Design a protein around this ligand. Sequence first.
Ligand SMILES: *Cc1c(COP(=O)(O)O)cnc(C)c1O
Length: 810
Amino acid sequence: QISVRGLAGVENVTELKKNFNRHLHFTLVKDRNVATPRDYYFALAHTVRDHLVGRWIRTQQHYYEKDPKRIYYLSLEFYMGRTLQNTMVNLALENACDEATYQLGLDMEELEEIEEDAGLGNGGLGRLAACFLDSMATLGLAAYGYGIRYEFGIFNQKICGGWQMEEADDWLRYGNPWEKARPEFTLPVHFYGRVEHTSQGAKWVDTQVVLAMPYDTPVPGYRNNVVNTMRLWSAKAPNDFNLGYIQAVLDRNLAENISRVLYPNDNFFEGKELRLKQEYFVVAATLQDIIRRFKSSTNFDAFPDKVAIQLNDTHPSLAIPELMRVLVDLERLDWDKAWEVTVKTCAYTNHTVLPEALERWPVHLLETLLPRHLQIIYEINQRFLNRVAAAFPGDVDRLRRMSLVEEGAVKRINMAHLCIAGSHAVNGVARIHSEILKKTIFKDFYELEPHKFQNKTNGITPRRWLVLCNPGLAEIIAERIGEEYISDLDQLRKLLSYVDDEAFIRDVAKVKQENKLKFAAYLEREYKVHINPNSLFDVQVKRIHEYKRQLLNCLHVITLYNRIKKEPNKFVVPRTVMIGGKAAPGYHMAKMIIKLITAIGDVVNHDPVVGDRLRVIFLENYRVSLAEKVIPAADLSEQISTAGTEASGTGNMKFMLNGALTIGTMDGANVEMAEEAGEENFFIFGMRVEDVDRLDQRGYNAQEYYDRIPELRQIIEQLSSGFFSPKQPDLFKDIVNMLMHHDRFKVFADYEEYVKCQERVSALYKNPREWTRMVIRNIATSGKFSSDRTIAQYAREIWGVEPSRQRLPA
Ligand SMILES: *Cc1c(COP(=O)(O)O)cnc(C)c1O
């Protein structure tokens, strides 16, 4: 069909078809008379999977022979999404499989929709890890993703009566063809117990044991025959466990609950024991696995030369004291030597500055669950503060500010401080975020060790986020500049010379229109809700959170609605406002925001006077698979977090690469995106970080904005009076009260500039040709945001390894 999807060779299409039938028969035990679409999906999945194994085996054999430095990316989240299409794209099998299934009388797209999303992540943090794995494989790095195989990933979101309802994500229900259980590599993990101090060294004894069973998932690089591994641990109770008989067996559930479910919090720390167990479980199993692999390749001096451990935020921070524990207690290295190795091995990436998101574990929890680790942490702190005291003599406050131990109601361990002390590199995920780290939260640490601090702006993989979800766009681009850009996104700059090309302008616009038509259709297919494909698609999809300000978007929507009702026969650019995202189950305000959005839709979508001029739709169950559908269809990308709160954002990059213009604040990566494309080609508005600080010093008083802005006042009064909730007039009292008296995110402060900026957007949309030309200017300069660039920087500036675009013999 299309170029970038590879060749549909005669021999390969024939081979695919027979292997497809082979699996349908021998693997699924079905014939064409009783096979269902799901059976066909699995038959295709196994057929494609077969093509991975050969490459997987030799890639691993290759690393064993050459023994390069290994990169271990530790994360409690990996938001992988679907694997079938991504695998075909990276193996250049898409057209062949498309043809083969066509000849078998099947629609491959229909089959791809059957695959369950692997949702082992909450959002941006987990998705970044997924993009990173893809890029590390594409750049030929000997990298391993290590995490937890949650039985239940992020919950599926159902909207009932306008409210979010959660339901278990039983993603393993029908089985997972992409994972290979490796029970032979099961490792023991210890919990509780006590510390015994003997003649030579301390011993952690009387512990309760849980087994960690690994499951390996292949991670194919883009057309380079490299297939790396993502190893996820599953909790298994030992057999002598708790060994009435029946009860003892049933109580195994206790130990195995460790890998049962993903905590559904985004940018929010919940200090529960189960979560701490998950964090140690992944770290303990991973480190033993890492050391085992190393001992094959006694003098750990070379450990840092053969191993790099990247901590995805502080979630796996226990890797530092655990590594010390193993080196000191088990390998018997002197403290100083062990510490040197640990620091040179570990690197930490911070993904937030929000106080409620930082991990601060109660000492009493670590005391009971991990007694030896607590001792090691105290020793680390003791030695670290001695260093601080020597550098800043007499500065007693600095000592208490930098301590890993926070005093107060209950003593807590600041995991971020632990990570900085035990890592040779600490990085932010966007230039502005990394600067904020050095100027605020980690200022004291930056002053003590400036060399440790770096920036590594986030990125997204152009394979899944362009080629896979937007083949039409990838095609028209390849037509003009070739296919090299897929693994070298910077080449998109060449598209700048086509900004005045009438043919190109027309094609870019045509692809967008086709995507919108396809999405508009999907909305009626699976969700039954009519929308106008000619309207501007205004979308904000991301987790529901106060800092992301879906509420600001809501205020604008209501403003648009009120303006139409005031002057019905006045022309306005038609818009379809789409907002989607999940709210953490225990985040009340977030759940109220979802209700507000659907409530606004209830009024707006049924008002005769509005017609098809304005529609408000809440995209149910936003997840990776849905993102792949809506992003390519978007015209306007909403990235409106309060300046200084969105560490980076990555959804923003996805929209930019897919032909949507961006309306946003100078926050996170938005700053660099505007810088790359040019501010004239971006819709920037609102306070900058400095303005937010100025307002805080003075004191934020929402009442002021309410008193000076009639349109804003009207909206608040509509919310308070029950205009959007007739049966329950005071339904949104909490929202109004928050907005008026304790809005940490200054929604009102950016309201005027936001509405004004939105008017500029509507003005440009009225001129199809110029809107599209600006779009081309965005797509052409999105190259910097490829995770290949990000990973190349991590590789050279932190891990000390050189990326390679060399194909392996397949
Ligand atoms: C990319 C992505 C995110 C991150 O979006 P932001 O707007 O940066 O918060 C969250 N969820 C999903 C499913 C994603 O694909």
